[PDB]
Amino acid sequence: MGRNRIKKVTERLPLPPNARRVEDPEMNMSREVVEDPGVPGTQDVTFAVAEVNGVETGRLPVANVVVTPAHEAVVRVGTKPGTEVPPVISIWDAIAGCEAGGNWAINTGNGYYGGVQFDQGTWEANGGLRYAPRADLATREEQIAVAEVTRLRQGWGAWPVCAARAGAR
């Protein structure tokens, strides 16, 4: 018995647009872009809410109804052939922490690029142009793909401080 800590509360919340995907054969498969944000809708969501001492201790949606439907968004998704990115096998995240503080897009004008501070020749020699003109223009996972090629072909010499710091082979 006693007062019930659980009450029903109905809230009007946004209904986010579904994204309809449109292929872009000029964009890397790693990439997705919002071409049209659509228009959010609205929905009435009923929650069971627990409160003790004027403080919410829990909530659970129990019902929902569309009020205004959203207008769909349009997302462009990359389908450029040959831009498949291998799965990442995090020694690299440690290295990028050391090299660039985890900033994969770093480009300070020091002659090095991206999270693991490739020079341009090393980026190109190890296949990086498949993904981007420079390392900093490529995704983390693309940069790691090229870093793995670099390591297999040339070793850890590109990272003469950070690789050892990261506990490399």
Swiss-Prot record:
- Per the record, the domain of life is Bacteria
- G5 domain ranges (all copies): 3-81
Location comes to: Cell membrane
Which pairs of positions does the record mark as disulfide bonds? C98-C162
Family to which this protein belongs: Belongs to the transglycosylase family. Rpf subfamily.
Annotated function: Factor that stimulates resuscitation of dormant cells. Has peptidoglycan (PG) hydrolytic activity. PG fragments could either directly activate the resuscitation pathway of dormant bacteria or serve as a substrate for endogenous Rpf, resulting in low molecular weight products with resuscitation activity.
Q: How does it assemble?
A: Monomer.
Name-wise, this protein is Resuscitation-promoting factor RpfB
Q: What is the native source organism of this protein?
A: Mycobacterium tuberculosis (strain CDC 1551 / Oshkosh)
User: Which taxonomic lineage is given here?
Assistant: Bacteria, Bacillati, Actinomycetota, Actinomycetes, Mycobacteriales
Q: Which gene encodes it?
A: rpfB
Q: Which residues of the full protein are shown?
A: 194 to 362 of 362
